[PDB]
CSV table of C-alpha atoms in Angstrom, one decimal:
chain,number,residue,atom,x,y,z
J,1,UNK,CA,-20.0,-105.6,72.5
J,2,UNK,CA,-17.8,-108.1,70.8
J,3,UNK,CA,-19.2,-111.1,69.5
J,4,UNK,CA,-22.5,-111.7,70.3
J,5,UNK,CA,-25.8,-109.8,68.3
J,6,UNK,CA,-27.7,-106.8,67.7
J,7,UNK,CA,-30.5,-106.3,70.4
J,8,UNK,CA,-33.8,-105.0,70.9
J,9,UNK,CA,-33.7,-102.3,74.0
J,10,UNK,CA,-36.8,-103.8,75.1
J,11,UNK,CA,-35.1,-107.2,75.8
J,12,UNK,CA,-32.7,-105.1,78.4
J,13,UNK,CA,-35.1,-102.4,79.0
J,14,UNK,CA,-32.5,-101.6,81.9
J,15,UNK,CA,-30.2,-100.5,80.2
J,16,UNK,CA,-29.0,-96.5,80.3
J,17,UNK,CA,-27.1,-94.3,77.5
J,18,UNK,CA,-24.9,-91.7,79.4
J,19,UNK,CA,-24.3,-88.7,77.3
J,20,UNK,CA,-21.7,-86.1,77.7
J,21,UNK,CA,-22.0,-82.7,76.2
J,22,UNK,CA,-19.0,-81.7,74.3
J,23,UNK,CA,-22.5,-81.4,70.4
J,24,UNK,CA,-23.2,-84.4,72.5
J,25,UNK,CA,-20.8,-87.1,73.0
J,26,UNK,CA,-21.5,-91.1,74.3
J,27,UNK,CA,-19.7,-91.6,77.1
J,28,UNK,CA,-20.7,-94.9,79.1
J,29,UNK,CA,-23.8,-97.6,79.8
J,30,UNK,CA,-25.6,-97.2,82.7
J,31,UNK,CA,-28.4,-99.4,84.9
J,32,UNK,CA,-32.0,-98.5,85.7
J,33,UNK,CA,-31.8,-99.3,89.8
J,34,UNK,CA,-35.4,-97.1,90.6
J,35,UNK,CA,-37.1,-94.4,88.8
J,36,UNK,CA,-34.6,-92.4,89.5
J,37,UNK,CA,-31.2,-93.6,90.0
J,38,UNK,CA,-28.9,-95.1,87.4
J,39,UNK,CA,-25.9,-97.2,88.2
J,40,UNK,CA,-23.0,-97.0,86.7
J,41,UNK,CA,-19.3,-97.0,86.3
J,42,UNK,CA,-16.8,-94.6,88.8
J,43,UNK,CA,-14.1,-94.2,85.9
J,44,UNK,CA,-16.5,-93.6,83.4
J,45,UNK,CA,-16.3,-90.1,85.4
J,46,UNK,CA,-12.4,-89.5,85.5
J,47,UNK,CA,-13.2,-86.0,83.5
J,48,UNK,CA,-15.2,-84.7,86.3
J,49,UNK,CA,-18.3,-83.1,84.4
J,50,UNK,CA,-20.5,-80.8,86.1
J,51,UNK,CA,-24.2,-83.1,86.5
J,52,UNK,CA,-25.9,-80.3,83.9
J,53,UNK,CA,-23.3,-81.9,81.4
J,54,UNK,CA,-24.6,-85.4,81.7
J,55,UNK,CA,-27.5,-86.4,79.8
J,56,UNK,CA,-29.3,-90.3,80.4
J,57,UNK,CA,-31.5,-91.5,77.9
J,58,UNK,CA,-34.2,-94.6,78.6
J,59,UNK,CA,-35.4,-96.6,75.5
J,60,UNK,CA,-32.8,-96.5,72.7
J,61,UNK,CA,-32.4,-99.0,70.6
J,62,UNK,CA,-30.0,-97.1,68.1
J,63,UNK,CA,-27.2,-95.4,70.1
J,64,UNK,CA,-27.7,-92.2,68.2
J,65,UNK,CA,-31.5,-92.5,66.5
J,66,UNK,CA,-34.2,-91.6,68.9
J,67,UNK,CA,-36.4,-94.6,70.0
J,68,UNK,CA,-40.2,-93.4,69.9
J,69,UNK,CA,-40.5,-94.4,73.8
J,70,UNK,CA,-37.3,-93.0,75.1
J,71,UNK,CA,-37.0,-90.8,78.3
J,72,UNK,CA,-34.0,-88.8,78.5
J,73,UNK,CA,-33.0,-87.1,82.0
J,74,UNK,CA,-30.8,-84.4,83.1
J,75,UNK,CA,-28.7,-85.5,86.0
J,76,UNK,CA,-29.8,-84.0,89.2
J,77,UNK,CA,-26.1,-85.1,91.0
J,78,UNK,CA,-23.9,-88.5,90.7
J,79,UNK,CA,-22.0,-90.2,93.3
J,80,UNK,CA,-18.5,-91.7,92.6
J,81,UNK,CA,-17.3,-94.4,94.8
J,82,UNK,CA,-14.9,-92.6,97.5
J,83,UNK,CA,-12.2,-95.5,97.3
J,84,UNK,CA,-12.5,-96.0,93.6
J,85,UNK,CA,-8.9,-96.6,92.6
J,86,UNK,CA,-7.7,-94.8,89.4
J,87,UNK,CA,-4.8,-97.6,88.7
J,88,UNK,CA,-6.4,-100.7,89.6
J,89,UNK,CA,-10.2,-99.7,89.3
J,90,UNK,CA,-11.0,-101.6,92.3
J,91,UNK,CA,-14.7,-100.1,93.8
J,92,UNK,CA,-15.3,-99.3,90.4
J,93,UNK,CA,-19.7,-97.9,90.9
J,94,UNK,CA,-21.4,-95.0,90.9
J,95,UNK,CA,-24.7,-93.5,91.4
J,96,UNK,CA,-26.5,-91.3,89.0
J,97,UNK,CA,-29.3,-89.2,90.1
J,98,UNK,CA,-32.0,-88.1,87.7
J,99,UNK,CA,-33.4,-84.4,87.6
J,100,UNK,CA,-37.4,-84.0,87.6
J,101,UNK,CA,-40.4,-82.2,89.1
J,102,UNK,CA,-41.0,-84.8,91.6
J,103,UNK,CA,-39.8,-88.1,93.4
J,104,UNK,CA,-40.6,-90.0,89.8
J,105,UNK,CA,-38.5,-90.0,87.1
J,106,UNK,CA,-38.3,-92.7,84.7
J,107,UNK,CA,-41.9,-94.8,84.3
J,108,UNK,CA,-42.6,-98.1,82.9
J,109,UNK,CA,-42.9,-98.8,79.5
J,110,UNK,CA,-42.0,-102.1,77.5
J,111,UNK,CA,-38.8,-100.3,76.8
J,112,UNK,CA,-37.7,-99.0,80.7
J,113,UNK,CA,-38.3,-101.0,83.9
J,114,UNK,CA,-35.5,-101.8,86.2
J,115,UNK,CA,-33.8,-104.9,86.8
J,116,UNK,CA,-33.5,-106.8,89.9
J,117,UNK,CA,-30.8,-106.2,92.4
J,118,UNK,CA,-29.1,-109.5,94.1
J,119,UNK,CA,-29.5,-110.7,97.3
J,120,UNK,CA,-26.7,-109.9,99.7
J,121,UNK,CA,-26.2,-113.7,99.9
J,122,UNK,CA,-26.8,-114.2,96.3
J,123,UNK,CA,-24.1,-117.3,95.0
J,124,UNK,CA,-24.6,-119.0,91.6
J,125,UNK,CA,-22.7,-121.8,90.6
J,126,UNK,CA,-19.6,-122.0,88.1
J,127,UNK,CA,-20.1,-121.6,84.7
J,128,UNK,CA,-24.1,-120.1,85.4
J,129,UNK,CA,-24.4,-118.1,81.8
J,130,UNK,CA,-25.2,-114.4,81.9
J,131,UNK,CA,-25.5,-112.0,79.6
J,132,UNK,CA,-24.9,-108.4,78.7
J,133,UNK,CA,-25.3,-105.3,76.8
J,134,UNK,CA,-24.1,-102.0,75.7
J,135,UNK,CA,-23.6,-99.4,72.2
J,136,UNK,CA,-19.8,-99.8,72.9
J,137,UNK,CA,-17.6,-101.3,70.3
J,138,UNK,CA,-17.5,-104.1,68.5
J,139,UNK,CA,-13.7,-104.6,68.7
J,140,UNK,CA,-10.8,-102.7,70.6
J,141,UNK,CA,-9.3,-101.9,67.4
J,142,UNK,CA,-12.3,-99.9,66.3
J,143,UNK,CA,-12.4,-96.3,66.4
J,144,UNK,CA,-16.2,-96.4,66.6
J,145,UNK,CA,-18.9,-97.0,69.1
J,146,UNK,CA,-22.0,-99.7,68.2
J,147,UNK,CA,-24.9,-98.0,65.9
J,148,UNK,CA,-26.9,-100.2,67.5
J,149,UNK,CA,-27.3,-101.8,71.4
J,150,UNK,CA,-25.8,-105.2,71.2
J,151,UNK,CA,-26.1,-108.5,73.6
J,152,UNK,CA,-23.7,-111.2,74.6
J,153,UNK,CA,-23.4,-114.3,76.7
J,154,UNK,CA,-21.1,-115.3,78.8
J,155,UNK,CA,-20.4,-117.5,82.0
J,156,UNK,CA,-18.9,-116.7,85.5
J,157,UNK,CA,-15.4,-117.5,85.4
J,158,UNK,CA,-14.6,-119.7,89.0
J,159,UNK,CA,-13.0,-116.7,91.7
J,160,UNK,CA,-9.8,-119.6,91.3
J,161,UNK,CA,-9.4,-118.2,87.3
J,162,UNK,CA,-10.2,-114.2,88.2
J,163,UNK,CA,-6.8,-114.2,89.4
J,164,UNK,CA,-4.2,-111.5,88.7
J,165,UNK,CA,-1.6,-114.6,87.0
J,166,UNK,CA,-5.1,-115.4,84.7
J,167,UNK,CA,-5.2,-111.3,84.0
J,168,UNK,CA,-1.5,-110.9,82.9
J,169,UNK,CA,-0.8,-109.6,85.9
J,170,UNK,CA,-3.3,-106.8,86.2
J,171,UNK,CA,-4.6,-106.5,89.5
J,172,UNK,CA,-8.2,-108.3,91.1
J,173,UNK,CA,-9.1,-107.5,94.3
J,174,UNK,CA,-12.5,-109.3,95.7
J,175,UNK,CA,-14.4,-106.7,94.6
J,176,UNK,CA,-14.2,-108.0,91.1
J,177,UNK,CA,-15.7,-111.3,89.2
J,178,UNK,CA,-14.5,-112.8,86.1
J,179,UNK,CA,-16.9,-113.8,83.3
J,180,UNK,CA,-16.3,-115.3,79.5
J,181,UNK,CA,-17.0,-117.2,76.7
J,182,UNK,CA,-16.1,-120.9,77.0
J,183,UNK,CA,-15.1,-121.9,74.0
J,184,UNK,CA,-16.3,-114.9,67.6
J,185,UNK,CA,-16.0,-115.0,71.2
J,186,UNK,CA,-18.4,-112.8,73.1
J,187,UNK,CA,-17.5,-110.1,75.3
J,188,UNK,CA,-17.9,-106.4,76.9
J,189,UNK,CA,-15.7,-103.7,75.0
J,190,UNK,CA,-14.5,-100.2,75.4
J,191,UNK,CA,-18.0,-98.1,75.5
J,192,UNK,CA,-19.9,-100.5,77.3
J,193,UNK,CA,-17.9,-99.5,80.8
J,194,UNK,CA,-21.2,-99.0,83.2
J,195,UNK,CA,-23.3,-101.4,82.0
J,196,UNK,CA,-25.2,-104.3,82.7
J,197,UNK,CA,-24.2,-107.7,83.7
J,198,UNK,CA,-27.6,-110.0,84.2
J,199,UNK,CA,-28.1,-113.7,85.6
J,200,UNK,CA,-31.8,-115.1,85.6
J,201,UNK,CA,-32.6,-115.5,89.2
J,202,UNK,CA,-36.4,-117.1,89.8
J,203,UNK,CA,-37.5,-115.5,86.7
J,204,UNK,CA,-36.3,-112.4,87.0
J,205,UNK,CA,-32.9,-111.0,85.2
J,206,UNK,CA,-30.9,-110.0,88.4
J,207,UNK,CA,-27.6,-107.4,88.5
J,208,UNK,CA,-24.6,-109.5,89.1
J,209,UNK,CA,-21.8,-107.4,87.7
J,210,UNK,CA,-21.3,-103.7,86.4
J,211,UNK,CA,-19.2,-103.8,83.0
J,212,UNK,CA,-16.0,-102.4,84.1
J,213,UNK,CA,-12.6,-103.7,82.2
J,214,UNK,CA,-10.4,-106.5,80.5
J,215,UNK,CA,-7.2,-106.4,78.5
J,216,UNK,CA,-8.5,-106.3,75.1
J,217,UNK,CA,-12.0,-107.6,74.3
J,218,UNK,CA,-12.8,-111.2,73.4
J,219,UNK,CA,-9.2,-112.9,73.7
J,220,UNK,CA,-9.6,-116.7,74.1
J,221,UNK,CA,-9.4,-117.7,77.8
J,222,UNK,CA,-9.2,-113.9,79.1
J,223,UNK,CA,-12.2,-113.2,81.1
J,224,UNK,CA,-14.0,-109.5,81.3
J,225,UNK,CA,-13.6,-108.1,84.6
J,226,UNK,CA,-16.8,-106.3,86.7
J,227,UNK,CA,-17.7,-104.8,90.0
J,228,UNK,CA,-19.0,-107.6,92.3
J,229,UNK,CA,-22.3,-105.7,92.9
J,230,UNK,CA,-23.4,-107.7,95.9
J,231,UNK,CA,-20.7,-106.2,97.7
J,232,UNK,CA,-22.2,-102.9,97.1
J,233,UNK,CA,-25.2,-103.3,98.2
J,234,UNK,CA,-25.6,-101.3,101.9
J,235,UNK,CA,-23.3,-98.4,99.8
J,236,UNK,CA,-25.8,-98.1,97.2
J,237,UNK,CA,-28.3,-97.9,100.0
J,238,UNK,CA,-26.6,-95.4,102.1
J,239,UNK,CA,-25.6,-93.6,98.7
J,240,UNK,CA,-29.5,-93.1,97.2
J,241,UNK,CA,-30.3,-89.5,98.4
J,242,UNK,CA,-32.7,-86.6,97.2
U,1,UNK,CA,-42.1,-105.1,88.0
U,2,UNK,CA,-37.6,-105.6,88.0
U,3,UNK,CA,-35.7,-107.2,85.8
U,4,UNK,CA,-39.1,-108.8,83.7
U,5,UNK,CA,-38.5,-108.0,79.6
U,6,UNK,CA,-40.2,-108.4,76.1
U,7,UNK,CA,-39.6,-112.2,75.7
């Protein structure tokens, strides 16, 4: 995360830390959906590791120091978008299945619940401020990941500004939505790919946009770009298999 | 239950 603070994971007790063995390496952020399905990013699997190589751990506050109420998983399977597009990283989702004994995986603690997925008809209004969180960097440059889980805020960018001319070019396709800081200049970074981006809807924080890319992180007046989740909604449905 | 956190 660029910009914004050092978190608690019990103030985004949705958030996931994907793990890839190498020796264990970090590899993306993930989303608590049910007990036992994670959302997450489709690129974030370009290297193609087998499930038994993925590891998802519920409850860290430190990226690499073991909270005392963390749950880590094996991955039973994980589902990559079928049209993701490798250039464009349009359909940019995936599904993560976690491995147990029975139909419950993770349980509820003050440090893993699940967040709230949006209506299908879910519209908030310009500028609504969201926020989100992730162990990735702090800046581009930086050849390290966050020690710590991190928090930001920013506001949906109008669909008008989420245009390829605002993007330098880079393509947008409706499945993507725009969101900044209007005015240290918060943002998502590399490493925080999969995660979380939450609105408060009626009291609840509610999934609005998967962390998926940008040019850069935190340049003034260039939005992050993430996977319109609402549009995903009957493919995570017909996607959540045992 | 979702998206509810240590306020």
């Amino acid at each position: 995360i660029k910009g914004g603070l050092f978190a608690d994971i019990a103030s985004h007790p949705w958030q996931a830390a994907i793990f890839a063995k190498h020796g264990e390496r970090f590899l993306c952020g993930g989303i608590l959906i049910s007990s036992c399905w994670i959302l997450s990013a489709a690129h974030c699997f370009q290297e193609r590791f087998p499930p038994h190589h993925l590891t998802v751990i519920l409850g860290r506050t430190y990226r690499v120091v073991p909270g005392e109420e963390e749950q880590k998983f094996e991955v039973e399977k994980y589902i990559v978008h079928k049209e993701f597009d490798d250039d464009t990283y349009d359909n940019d989702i995936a599904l993560l299945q976690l491995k147990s004994d029975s139909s419950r995986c993770a349980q509820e603690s003050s440090v893993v619940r699940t967040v709230c997925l949006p209506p299908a008809d879910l519209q908030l209004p310009d500028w609504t401020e969201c926020e989100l969180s992730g162990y990735g960097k702090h800046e581009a440059l930086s050849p390290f990941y966050s020690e710590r889980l991190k928090e930001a805020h920013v506001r949906l960018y109008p669909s008008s500004r989420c245009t390829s001319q605002h993007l330098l070019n880079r393509t947008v396709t409706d499945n993507m939505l725009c969101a900044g800081d209007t005015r240290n200049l918060h943002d998502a970074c590399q490493g925080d790919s999969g995660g979380p981006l939450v609105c408060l809807n009626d009291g609840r924080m509610t999934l609005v946009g998967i962390i998926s890319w940008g040019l850069g992180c935190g340049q003034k007046d260039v939005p992050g770009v993430y996977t319109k989740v609402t549009n995903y909604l009957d493919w995570i449905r017909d996607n959540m298999r045992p | 239950t979702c998206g509810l956190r240590q306020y």
